[PDB]
Amino acid sequence: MEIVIRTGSGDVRGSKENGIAVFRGIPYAEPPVGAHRFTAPRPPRPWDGVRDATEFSATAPRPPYPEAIGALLIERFIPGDDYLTLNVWTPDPNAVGLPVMVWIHGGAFTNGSGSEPVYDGAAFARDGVVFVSFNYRLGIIGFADLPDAPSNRGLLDQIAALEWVRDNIARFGGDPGNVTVFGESAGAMSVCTLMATPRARGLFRRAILQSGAGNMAVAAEDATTIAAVIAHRLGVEPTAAALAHVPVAQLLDVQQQVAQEIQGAPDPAVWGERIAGGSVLLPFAPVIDGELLSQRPAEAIAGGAGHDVDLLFGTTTDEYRLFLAPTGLLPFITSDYVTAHLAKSGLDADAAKAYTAEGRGEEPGDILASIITDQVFRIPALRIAESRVDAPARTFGYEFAWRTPQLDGILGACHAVELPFVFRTLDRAASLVGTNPPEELAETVHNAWVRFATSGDPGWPAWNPETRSVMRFDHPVSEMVTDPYPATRALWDGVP
| Domain chopping of the chain, boundaries | 2-218+287-302, 310-490
Q: Which residue in 415, 418, 469, 478 is the catalytic one?
A: 415
Amino acid in position 389: V
Rounded Cα–Cα distance for residues 29 and 136 (Å): 10
415 is catalytic: yes
For residue 26, the cross-strand partners are: 86
Domain 2-218+287-302 matches domain 310-490 at the CATH topology level: yes
The resolution of the experimental structure, rounded to one decimal in Å, is 1.4
How many C-beta atoms surround the C-beta of residue 10 within 10 A? 16
Experimental method reported for this structure: X-ray
Listed residue (93, 114, 116, 96) closest to 105, CA to CA: 114
Rounded Cα–Cα distance for residues 252 and 297 (Å): 27
Contact 99, 130 (CB under 8 A): yes
Contact 391, 309 (CB under 8 A): no
105 is catalytic: no
Q: Which residue in 185, 211, 370, 478 is the catalytic one?
A: 185
Contact 93, 21 (CB under 8 A): yes
Rounded Cα–Cα distance for residues 37 and 245 (Å): 10
Contact 21, 89 (CB under 8 A): yes
For residue 480, the cross-strand partners are: 471
Rounded Cα–Cα distance for residues 375 and 345 (Å): 9
How distant, in Å, are the alpha carbons of 25, 71, 117, 433, 441 from that of 64?
23, 11, 17, 20, 30
The topology (CATH level 3) of 310-490 is: Rossmann fold (3.40.50)
Q: Which residue in 116, 184, 319, 399 is the catalytic one?
A: 319
- DSSP 3-state helix, strand, coil percentages of the chain (rounded to 5)? 40, 15, 45
Domain 2-218+287-302 CATH superfamily = Alpha/Beta hydrolase fold, catalytic domain (3.40.50.1820)
319 is catalytic: yes
**How far is Cα of residue 424 from the mean position of the Cα atoms in its chain?**
18
